[PDB]
DNA sequence: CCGACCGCGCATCAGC
DNA sequence: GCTGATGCGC
DNA sequence: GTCGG
C-alpha cells in the first residue's frame, strides 16, 4: 500500500462528509478518489500528479499537496477538535446507528460509550445488538477463520437440503487474507425468479444455524435477506472467537450470476460497474441485467449463464474476483 | 455550466 | 392494518 | 467533489 497517508485522509474526509456534513456525494466523492489511489502503482509525489487521476479533481489535489508538505490537513485536525463532530464520528461507528441517530444522540448529551450502555431504552434492536458487540466487530477475521467459518456453513446447510448451494462472496470472494464479515450467497432449485414453491426456504438455514449455535443475534430477517452474528466454537480453556457480522442474501438460483457479481463486489466496483452498465445502455441489479430506452423504461431480463455474460454487455474484459478490490 | 453521481432489503415511523 | 417515506445497511 | 457533454 503505497500512499496510505493520503488514502487515509480521504477516508477520513469521506466520512466527515458522510456522517457529519450528511453530504453524501461528497463522501462518495472521497471514496472514489481514495479508491484510485489506493491502487495506483506510483508512490504518489505531488498533487498535479494525483489529479491526472480520474475522480481526482482540484480541490482533492490541493488537499493532497498540503498533506505530502506537512503530514498533516488542518481541516481534519479541525474536525479531529470540535467535540460535536468528533462524537457524532465515533456513534456511527456503532451497527445501526448513522449519521442521522449519531447527531440526536449527541443532541440528547450521549456522545461515548458508556452513555449508550446507559441509555439502551433509547436503542432499538440492531443498535443494542450492535453495541454489545462493538469491541468484537472492529476485529477483523482473518482468513483462516473465513474458512473454518466456511466449513460450518456449508455443511449445515447440507443437512436442511442437499440442493442448497451456498457461495461465500464478499472480500473472502476477492481473495482478502482478512474480511470485515463474512457474505453468504444461498441457491436452492425451487426458489426461481417465479415460483415459491417451499416457503421459509431461508428461514430452515437460519434456523439450523441457530441449532448449532453458529448464529448468536439477529438484526434483521426476512425471506431474502438476513443480518446477524455468528461466532466459531472453540476448545477446552481455549478462549472464545470474537463475534462475527454474518450476512445471508438469498437469491432466485436462474439469477445466480447476477447475485455473485453484486456479492463479491467490492461496492464500490458494483458503483463503477452499475454506473458504466448506465453509458452503455442498461441497468444491473442483483437480479437482472436490463436494456433501457431513451424513456427511461427499465427493460427485459437478458440472458446470462456466466459472470461474463454481464462484463461482455457492458463491453468489459473479465475482471477476476481479485481484481474488484476497488 | 450543471446534471448525474448504483440499486436494493429490512426496520421503523408517520399518517390515515 | 396498510402505504409511503425515511434510516441504515448489503 | 468531480465529471461529461
Ligand atoms: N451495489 C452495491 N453493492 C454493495 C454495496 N455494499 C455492499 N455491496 C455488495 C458488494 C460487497 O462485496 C458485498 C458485501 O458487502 P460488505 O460485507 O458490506 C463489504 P465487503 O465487500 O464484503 O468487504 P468487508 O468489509 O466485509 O471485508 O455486497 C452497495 O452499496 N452497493
Ligand atoms: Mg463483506
Ligand atoms: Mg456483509
Ligand atoms: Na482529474
Ligand atoms: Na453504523
Not at 158 to 169: G, L, M, N, P, R
Not at 227 to 248: A, F, T, W
Not at 300 to 309: A, F, G, I, N, T
Request: aromatic fraction near 8%; hydrophobic fraction near 30%; include cysteine.
Amino acid at each position: 500500500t503505497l500512499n496510505g497517508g493520503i488514502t487515509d485522509m480521504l477516508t477520513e474526509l469521506a466520512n466527515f462528509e458522510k456522517n457529519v456534513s450528511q453530504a453524501i456525494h461528497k463522501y462518495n466523492a472521497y471514496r472514489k478518489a481514495a479508491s484510485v489511489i489506493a491502487k495506483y502503482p506510483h508512490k504518489i509525489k505531488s498533487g498535479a500528479e494525483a489529479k491526472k487521476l480520474p475522480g481526482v479533481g482540484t480541490k482533492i489535489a490541493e488537499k493532497i499537496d498540503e498533506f505530502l508538505a506537512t503530514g498533516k490537513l488542518r481541516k481534519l485536525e479541525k474536525i479531529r477538535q470540535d467535540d460535536t463532530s468528533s462524537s457524532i464520528n465515533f456513534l456511527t461507528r456503532v451497527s445501526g446507528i448513522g449519521p442521522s441517530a449519531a447527531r440526536k444522540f449527541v443532541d440528547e448529551g450521549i456522545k461515548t460509550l458508556e452513555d449508550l450502555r446507559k441509555n439502551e431504552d433509547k436503542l432499538n434492536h440492531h443498535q443494542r445488538i450492535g453495541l454489545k458487540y462493538f469491541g468484537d466487530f472492529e476485529k477483523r477475521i482473518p482468513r483462516e477463520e473465513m474458512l473454518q467459518m466456511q466449513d460450518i456453513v456449508l455443511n449445515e446447510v447440507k443437512k436442511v437440503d442437499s440442493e442448497y448451494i451456498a457461495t461465500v462472496c464478499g472480500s473472502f470472494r476477492r481473495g482478502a487474507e482478512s474480511s470485515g464479515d463474512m457474505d453468504v450467497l444461498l441457491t436452492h432449485p425451487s426458489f426461481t425468479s417465479e415460483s415459491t414453491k417451499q416457503p421459509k426456504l431461508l428461514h430452515q438455514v437460519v434456523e439450523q444455524l441457530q441449532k448449532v449455535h453458529f448464529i448468536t443475534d439477529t438484526l434483521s430477517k426476512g425471506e431474502t435477506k438476513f443480518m446477524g452474528v455468528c461466532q466459531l466454537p472453540s476448545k477446552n480453556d481455549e478462549k472464545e472467537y470474537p463475534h462475527r457480522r454474518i450476512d445471508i442474501r438469498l437469491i432466485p438460483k436462474d439469477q445466480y450470476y447476477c447475485g455473485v457479481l453484486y456479492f463479491t463486489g467490492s461496492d464500490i466496483f458494483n458503483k463503477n460497474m452499475r454506473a458504466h452498465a448506465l453509458e452503455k445502455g442498461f441497468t444491473i441489479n442483483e437480479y437482472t441485467i436490463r436494456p433501457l430506452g431513451v424513456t427511461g423504461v427499465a427493460g427485459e431480463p437478458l440472458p446470462v449463464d456466466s459472470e461474463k455474460d454481464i462484463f461482455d454487455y457492458i463491453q468489459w474484459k473479465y475482471r477476476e474476483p481479485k481484481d474488484r478490490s476497488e
